[PDB]
Amino acid sequence: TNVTGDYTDCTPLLGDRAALDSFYEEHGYLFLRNVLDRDLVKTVAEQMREGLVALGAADPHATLEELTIDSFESVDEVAMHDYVKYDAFWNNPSTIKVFEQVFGEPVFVFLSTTIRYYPSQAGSEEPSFHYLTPFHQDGFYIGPNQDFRTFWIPLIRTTRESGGVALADGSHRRGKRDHVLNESFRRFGHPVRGIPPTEVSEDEHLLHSPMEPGDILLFHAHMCHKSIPNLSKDPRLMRMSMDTRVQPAKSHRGFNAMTPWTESAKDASKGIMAK
Ligand SMILES: C[C@H]1CC[C@@H]2C(C(=O)O)=C[C@H]3CC(C)(C)C[C@]213
Ligand SMILES: O=C(O)CCC(=O)C(=O)O
Ligand SMILES: [Fe+3]
Numbered sequence: 001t002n003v004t005g006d007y008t009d010c011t012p013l014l015g016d017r018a019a020l021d022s023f024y025e026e027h028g029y030l031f032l033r034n035v036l037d038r039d040l041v042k043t044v045a046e047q048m049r050e051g052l053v054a055l056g057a058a059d060p061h062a063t064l065e066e067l068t069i070d071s072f073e074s075v076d077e078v079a080m081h082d083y084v085k086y087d088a089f090w091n092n093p094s095t096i097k098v099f100e101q102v103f104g105e106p107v108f109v110f111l112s113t114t115i116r117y118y119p120s121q122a123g124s125e126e127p128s129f130h131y132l133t134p135f136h137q138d139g140f141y142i143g144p145n146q147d148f149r150t151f152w153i154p155l156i157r158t159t160r161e162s163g164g165v166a167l168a169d170g171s172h173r174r175g176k177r178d179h180v181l182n183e184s185f186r187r188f189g190h191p192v193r194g195i196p197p198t199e200v201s202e203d204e205h206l207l208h209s210p211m212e213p214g215d216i217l218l219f220h221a222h223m224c225h226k227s228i229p230n231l232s233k234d235p236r237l238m239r240m241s242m243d244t245r246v247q248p249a250k251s252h253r254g255f256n257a258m259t260p261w262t263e264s265a266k267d268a269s270k271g272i273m274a275k
């Protein structure tokens with residue numbers, strides 16, 4: 001793996017505004033352990049599971065960690081957005097309290113959330129990983145304001161093998177980087193764009209650590225990050241997660257902030273190619 005390090009546990013920095021902001025400024029992310037209500041997170045995992053039983057031919061008697069699906073692509077993603085009640089989760093007072101502590105002011109949560117339910121493909125000779133993400137910055141496609149932050153949460157635990165999101169430590173300090181067409185990552189049967197290896201720095205150490213439901217990983221608009229594929233074997237786990245963006249309540253609310261995933265993903269996926 002190109003991963004060379006773990007996320008730093010930033011939870012004890014929450015009590016110190018100056019130290020929290022200092023870490024975030026240098027590194028471009030915060031990793032917070034067990035700050036969300038784990039029981040609330042479980043209910044969202046359960047919602048996703050029931051969607052997968054209805055739409056992905058998942059075992060109706062499997063536990064969350066026993067669950068699998070034959071194919072991410074066979075699942076109607078639009079219909080999954082009716083099952084997973086993410087807005088109710090993000091806007092729960094317990095969740096909002098955490099967001100407000102991070103920003104130090106009232107927040108607005110994007111009306112778009114991406115939901116991810118990725119089965120293990122350990123052993124597959126022709127794995128389907130084209131639905132993952134290349135190295136990119138969320139600020140490449142979200143704007144015009146660049147003061148939102150991405151909030152990424154596991155719905156069930158991740159392992160180093162089941163994957164998640166890898167962060168290039170401190171890669172958010174030189175603005176937007178070039179994103180170029182990459183045939184190996186696709187949405188709606190067309191390539192998307194990612195940051196090429198020539199815009200990657202060896203100094204921006206790649207980080208990924210296992211996370212538990214209740215944890216949050218959040219990062220700057222210019223943080224360069226990529227998906228880690230699910231090659232889990234023991235245990236063989238689904239990688240179940242969701243990501244939204246959050247910004248100060250006073251900041252401009254752009255297209256991405258105001259438009260649900262079902263009404264924007266297709267158009268945005270085409271739109272980025274003209275950027
Ligand atoms: C920039 C690329 C990779 C990351 C984003 C992404 C994702 O799944 O996070 C899929 C592509 C389509 C998009 C318009 C939402 C922008 C994406
Ligand atoms: O979880 C992934 O595979 C990618 C996540 C991502 O790009 C994001 O949260 O902005
Ligand atoms: Fe992203």
Ligand SMILES: [Mg+2]
Nearest residue numbers: 059060061062
């Ligand atoms: Mg059985």
Ligand SMILES: [Mg+2]
Nearest residue numbers: 172173174175
């Ligand atoms: Mg800058």
